[PDB]
Each structure stands twice: as C-alpha cells, then as structure tokens.
Amino acid sequence: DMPVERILEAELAVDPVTNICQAADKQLFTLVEWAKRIPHFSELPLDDQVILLRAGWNELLIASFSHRSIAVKDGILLATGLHVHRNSAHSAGVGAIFDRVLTELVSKMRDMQMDKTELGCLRAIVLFNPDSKGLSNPAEVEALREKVYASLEAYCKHKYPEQPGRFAKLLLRLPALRSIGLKCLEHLFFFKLIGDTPIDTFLMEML
C-alpha cells in the first residue's frame, strides 16, 4: 500500500560554493527524515536504505530546489534562503548547468504547475531506484517504485482528467533530472578535491 496522502504529508513535513555546500549539508539531514516518512522505506533492510539514499540524494535535492524556485525570477532559491543567480553561478564555474536547471526543470515545473503531491511522487520514484548497485533484492525496490507510480497516475487522472498526457509528462522530466544530478555531482567532487568545501560534514561523507 502506497497512499499519495502520505507522500504529500512527507513533503509538507520537511561565495557561492560555500553557500551551495552549506545548503546541501543542511538538506541532507532533512532528506533522511523525509525518506523515513515515505511508506515502507524504513521497512527495507538498513543497508538497502543506505544504498538508495547514496544513489539518489543529489537528484532528490535538485528536484526540491527546482520546485521551490518556480516563483523566483531567473535564479535558484536554496533551502538556506540564499539565492543563486547567473553571475554567481558563472563565478563558481557552473553557469551551464545553472541554465539547464532553469530550462529543463524550473521553467517546465512552472509551465505545467506541477503540484506538491506530484513532486513528492517523482521524488519517491527516484528514492526507490532499483538500479542502485548492491541492493540485497533489487526487485523489492522495483515493487515499491511500481506502487508509487500507480498511485501517481490515479492521482493525476482524478485531479487533471482534462490533461491525459500529464502523468507521462511528469515521468519524462526524470531523464533531465538524471543528467543534471550527474553534472552537479561532478562539480561537487571538484570543489571538495581542491579544498573549497566545508570539512567534517554529512556532505563530505556523501562524497
């Protein structure tokens, strides 16, 4: 069982480089509390819970700050309340991936007015990633993923029957999120390699 109500409840319950790192470290503690509120996540083996969050944390944070930023003009609102605009993104060397977040995620979430239940379900789908390496029983994760997207489709079809393509439109933002998560992670590993990141943090562990 996988009720969209509980997925929405999980959502509602929770120098540029330094600003980005501080903001990611903060949201990693929050992301663990979100994951435990997703139905049946905490019933997986503990080592599989570790594997899923290591595989998806950066996509899960990117989805959230993208949805948070739909009302910001040409910028990204970080969870600390600080903004990232184009000037500072270029000074961090991440101008091109910044543009891709705006054009592939924020603007498209805005266009279709993606709501918070839909965001929560896409994030639960990312969380339940059955391709994560080393899972004790990948198919158990695929099973939960399938329950999430069954619930998402029924939700969209009830709330937005005039938009029959809406469910697929949501799922087809996931390749963009995967591209963009990979590139953000590359920059983060670089910041750490050259010694520009805060030390002794949860973020350092994830990297």
Binding site: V32, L46, Q49, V50, R54, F202, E205
Partner: peptide, 13 residues
Amino acid sequence: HKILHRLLQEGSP
C-alpha cells in the same frame, strides 16, 4: 557511511 547509517536508525534523543 557512519553518519547516514546512524541517522536512519530510530531511537535518537
């Protein structure tokens, strides 16, 4: 993964 493994476990003050 000491931090994540701890955070996932229930019963923390």
